[PDB]
Design a protein around this ligand. Structure first.
Ligand SMILES: OC[C@H]1O[C@H](O)[C@H](O)[C@@H](O)[C@H]1O
Ligand SMILES: OC[C@H]1O[C@H](O)[C@H](O)[C@@H](O)[C@H]1O
Lengths: 691, 691
């Protein structure tokens, strides 16, 4: 896999490079006189880019073969005249009513054969030929019309593919899946082997016997190999649609182009790292996680985004000023979080900061979603903070932040979309264990130990790092196995955890003892698992460790430890459980490297407490200060190292005090003491320094 | 109802009778070189029977009308020559893809009309004539081919009927249900009366107006008499299918034949006692209940299996060496439980001990289900315990265990599949009360008081016992009523609980006060119920009793007690409830016997504490020992008494001390003190002795 060449949206003629600042703009939802008020307010706020026409198909093509562009010409002109750049959409995110009325075969079909209707959005099949013809047609009309518009700086292709239409079970999907399987496997016997079809009379004579994983009765168990391929296929079918639209636009109007991802700790609707290879620049939608996890999970997701972009600058396409509309309980943001959240994504390497949306809708299903201009209007704390943020971004651009990169960490935490899919089967050891939670737990625990990790997709250069975490990385292919073995052999410092390396990329178990492909590297052998929980009276729901930590949900049964290895921590338990004195945490010497195995789920807190002794043995340096977990430190720098920025975020509900090590440029809820060269950072506060 | 003559699978020429030991064997999932390792490991383990071809249809008939037997002939010859017998499947458990592609009408239909697809197993309609054709054809091909094979000791017809295909709502089912109703009732007027169809305008003019209980809207209320008959019909249709396959194998290849049941405390997909009349020997699958109930519920289930078998030896077709795959959290087994669990089924009368499965699948939906040979291979604690168990079963057969029977208890606990169905309606007094939990509660509480009960299906000879429990036995027919009355009148000691005798076998309520067919027998009259729970603030969630116990979920409102009866325990409550000082537990003198009435759910704990007084009133003797409930004592003996075995299982997490009353044969996590003639049984331990 090669990436496309990097391309970034360029300034309007006569403008200098800025951190792009703005949001989705939907003037089609407002009387025309509002657009001038919009433009005045945008200039006040320091907004310099908006994303237009994303769901405007029914206005752009109001009946088949009739096109209406004048309204959009006029808004683009207003914006451009005022010095505001337009990120223009294909307009193909969701079809108009006329089209699905005429062609119901466009509508995706669920696992039971029920047809998703219009009434919301993105109700189209990824593999519909009819819908592709309509999408490519609008793409060509749009590219033809805006080819020479100097105010349009980039293409926003469709919108968040697969958010609603990830899975289709129609005849189109059935045929496409068959062809996808022929292309991957060549022969039906290679499919029979991969999926283990000798089990339960599933063996197929030919590729026409491959059906999608449709309804099989509630609570019954689908073929796991097949269901993993179904997820890979579904991602790939949408990726092919993206490529088609992308290609139809660029053939006519070559401009920097992206499509917006949905990278967050727990969102795996697509293999976003694979998709990263086909965008010109990575753009992402991220919304805060409610409660205590808000800051850490956002910094993590932004970190992953940077990792998908291979440390190139990236584009925050969407986040919220305050509440969203789509949770059961739509918590608002607290004072300071607007500025802080935006500066967090920026610190993780974004050169653009954009919201959904500019102006809060007064009608429709997202009327309750926050905006930059709330229902309350610009006499509001939200808009004041938006303007403050505008001025902050202008300041950081002035001081040279643009094109700097997220500094390389000591530690790469590995993420694999496919490993997450493997852990989603309904007949694994426990539904309570998925891939995705572990890398996040480790990011938080390393931050508690004063270390900001990088998060690196499994295809990416994790093997170039001082230290690497494999966090519940269920899949290890032959290839990844070899990369792991050699990494350690040649000086690598590895952490491996439970639920890592169970299977290969066909979802076949590595035999002989878990983790079956790398027992030599970790220096342990696991014969079986001990899932934990509380779903009946008297189930085992925890295991204490002799290092003052407690395991929940899952523990390995380690039955041997190599001679090159030693036990760092052991379980304490009732004798009849088998776990008393059993190994929990181990470190192994392998070539010139070391590998630690963490044989149970310890959570953030457990990991955080377990880590000092492991980091010491593996030779990973951190601060000794007991306050090192209070702030998250995030650095951007150019290649020289001359333009070097440090972002410091309070992670706590206490006042955090830090050294100021340069010129302070931005201070949200932070007060510097010039003479003592110190700063007190309030809760939800941030200080930005240039070294 | 007649049972079939008992037949048991016989040894291979030249072998002595043994406790059949082994499991499901799936060579078709492995390279043929692996079969040699399998056979060597089976011999090391003392395995002497395997169950083959259960899901092998796609290999035996890889296309319509093409048969491939050679692989199977070879595997069978490898086994038989190594002294391992073969329980051969009909292969008809689940159809291959080519068959359902060609004949979609085979596929069962859910209540909403959505067709169950292939992708897991058993996706066929019980009443499909085309599927019957295919299944009988393969039966005959297999019978014709293996009728003179001397290594095939029995037939395993299909597999676990109804586990996935209990209910079908297709046109086939509709027509079959009409004919079923006409056979049972004769006239549409008799159906109308049974189902109470004057209510809600449901009266039918003819049999063509009967439809299955299909979708009526979420939360709406099906006609209860029809639903009960639907569950009766569903079990009967699968039974007719089983009999057709059976008769087709046996007309060609008369060998001993069974089909595996799923008897456990809570599983009632079929009337397994009824199905018990059509097997030659009873076989069963049972998997452990997680947590505290593991040991007790397994013993209870084994006990019920023995009851269904009418005290003939029976075949444990499946259980697990450790974790299963199909729970949300798949807990492992603790040290010693492999052996103990097997010995529990044995103590309760099994002459065969078999596992799912011999070797752990490395691919497919049950890859995480434990086995006799784990992924880790034969160098494993599981394989060592499998080998130790094999030796123990050889030892026990050498000492004369075979064909001994579970000793007749003082107490029969009555179980009625149909009564559980009656309690399943959505408009009962409370969804918290079902038939099934009460017999289990009584079994455990009787064990707390040092008595091992028998569990006897309602059709079975419970009226021959010293004492009898009717536990939430919601149906009492006229015939069962007469049997209960005559039992007590002639000297029986009866325990009757709440939710007993509400309805007849048509689900019509017995009028005049509950329980309305037997008020004279129990000497009480219930006017109404008081369900209890916590589903709004301030609901009544318990009622204390003056014997130091607490009722939950349900209490009866007893408003009169007969002159022949007296009150043993009363409720204590806030006065506004109406329950302060009301009767809770009574005893009535009726003819030469007694009937105790327990008018609330006391649970295991409350029943345990209540039982000393009740046992004394009813003249049922038990130990006086404080420690009488620490251990479950299970006994098997021949008709003479000459071979008399005692199994002693620790039920606790303490060391149980016991008296050794014969020769110790098997001691798992138990230590005999020779000279004191005592033994220390560790948690999860068991001692087996011959007197
Ligand atoms: O949070 C809601 C918001 O989510 C994403 O960013 C979408 O692309 C937007 O159109 C909107 O639906
Ligand atoms: O525990 C899993 C196991 O359950 C039963 O015993 C079935 O008959 C087997 O085929 C298998 O599915």
């Amino acid at each position: 896999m090669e990436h496309r060449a990097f391309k970034w949206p360029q300034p309007l003629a006569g403008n200098k490079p800025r951190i792009w600042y703005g949001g989705d703009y939907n003037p089609d939802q407002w009387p025309e006189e509002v657009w001038d008020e919009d433009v005045a307010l945008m200039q006040q706020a320091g907004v310099n880019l908006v994303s237009v026409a994303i769901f405007s198909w029914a206005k752009l093509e109001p009946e088949e073969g009739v096109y209406d562009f004048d309204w959009l010409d006029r808004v683009i002109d207003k914006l451009g005249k005022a010095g505001i750049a337009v990120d223009l959409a294909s307009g193909t995110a969701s079809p108009p009513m006329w089209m699905t009325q005429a062609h119901p075969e466009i509508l995706w079909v669920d696992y039971r054969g029920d047809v998703c209707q219009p009434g919301a959005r993105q109700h189209w099949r990824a593999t519909s030929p009819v819908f592709l013809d309509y999408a490519l047609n609008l793409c060509r009309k749009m590219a033809e019309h805006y080819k020479d518009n100097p105010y349009v700086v980039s293409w926003h292709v469709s919108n968040a593919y697969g958010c609603h239409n990830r899975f289709d079970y129609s005849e189109d999907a059935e045929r496409a899946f068959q062809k996808w399987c022929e292309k991957k496997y060549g022969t039906i016997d290679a499919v029979n082997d991969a999926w283990g079809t000798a089990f339960w009379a599933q063996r197929m004579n030919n590729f026409s016997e491959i059906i999608p994983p449709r309804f099989i009765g509630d609570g019954n168990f689908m073929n796991p190999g097949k269901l993993l391929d179904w997820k890979r296929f579904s991602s790939d079918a949408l990726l092919d649609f993206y490529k088609a639209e992308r290609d139809a636009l660029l053939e006519i109007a070559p401009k920097p182009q992206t499509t917006n991802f949905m990278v967050s700790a727990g969102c795996t609707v697509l293999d976003y790292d694979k998709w990263g290879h086909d965008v010109d620049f990575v753009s992402n939608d991220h919304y805060f996680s409610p409660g205590e996890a808000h800051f850490d999970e956002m910094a993590y997701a932004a970190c992953l985004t940077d990792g998908i972009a291979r440390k190139n600058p990236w584009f925050l396409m969407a986040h919220s000023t305050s509440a969203v509309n789509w949770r059961p309980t739509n918590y608002r943001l607290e004072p300071g979080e607007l500025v802080r959240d935006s500066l967090a994504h920026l610190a993780m390497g974004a050169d653009a900061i954009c919201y959904f949306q500019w102006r809060q809708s007064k009608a429709g299903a997202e009327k309750w979603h926050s905006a930059m201009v709330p229902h309350a209007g610009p006499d509001s704390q939200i808009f004041r903070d938006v303007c403050e943020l505008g001025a902050d971004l202008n300041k950081l651009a002035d001081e040279g932040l643009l094109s700097t990169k997220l500094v390389k960490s000591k530690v790469a935490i590995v993420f694999d979309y496919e490993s997450q899919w493997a852990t989603e089967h309904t007949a694994t050891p426990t539904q309570e264990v998925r891939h995705w939670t572990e890398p996040l737990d480790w990011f938080r625990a390393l931050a508690d130990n004063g270390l900001t990790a990088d998060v690196v997709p499994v295809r990416g250069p994790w093997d170039e790092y001082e230290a690497v975490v494999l966090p519940s990385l269920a899949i290890l292919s032959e290839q990844t196995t070899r990369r792991v073995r050699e990494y350690v052999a040649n000086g690598g410092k590895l952490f491996v955890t439970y639920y890592t390396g169970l299977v290969d990329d066909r979802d076949h178990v590595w035999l002989g003892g878990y983790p079956g492909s790398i027992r030599d590297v970790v220096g342990v052998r696991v014969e079986e698992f001990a899932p934990m929980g509380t779903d009946a009276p008297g189930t085992m729901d925890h295991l204490d460790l002799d290092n003052g930590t407690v395991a929940h949900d899952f523990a390995d049964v380690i039955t041997s430890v190599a001679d090159t290895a030693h036990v760092v921590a052991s379980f304490k338990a009732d004798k009849w459980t088998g776990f008393d004195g059993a190994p929990a945490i181990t470190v192994n010497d392998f070539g010139d490297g070391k590998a630690a195995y963490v044989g149970a789920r310890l959570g953030r807190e457990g990991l955080a407490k377990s880590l000092p002794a492991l980091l010491e043995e593996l030779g990973i340096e951190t601060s000794a200060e007991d306050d090192r977990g209070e702030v998250l430190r995030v650095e951007r720098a150019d290649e020289t190292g001359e333009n070097h920025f440090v972002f410091l975020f309070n992670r706590t509900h206490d006042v955090a005090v830090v050294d100021v090590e340069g010129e302070p440029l931005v201070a949200s809820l932070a007060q510097v003491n010039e003479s003592e060269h110190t700063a007190a950072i309030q809760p939800n506060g941030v200080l930005v320094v240039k070294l």
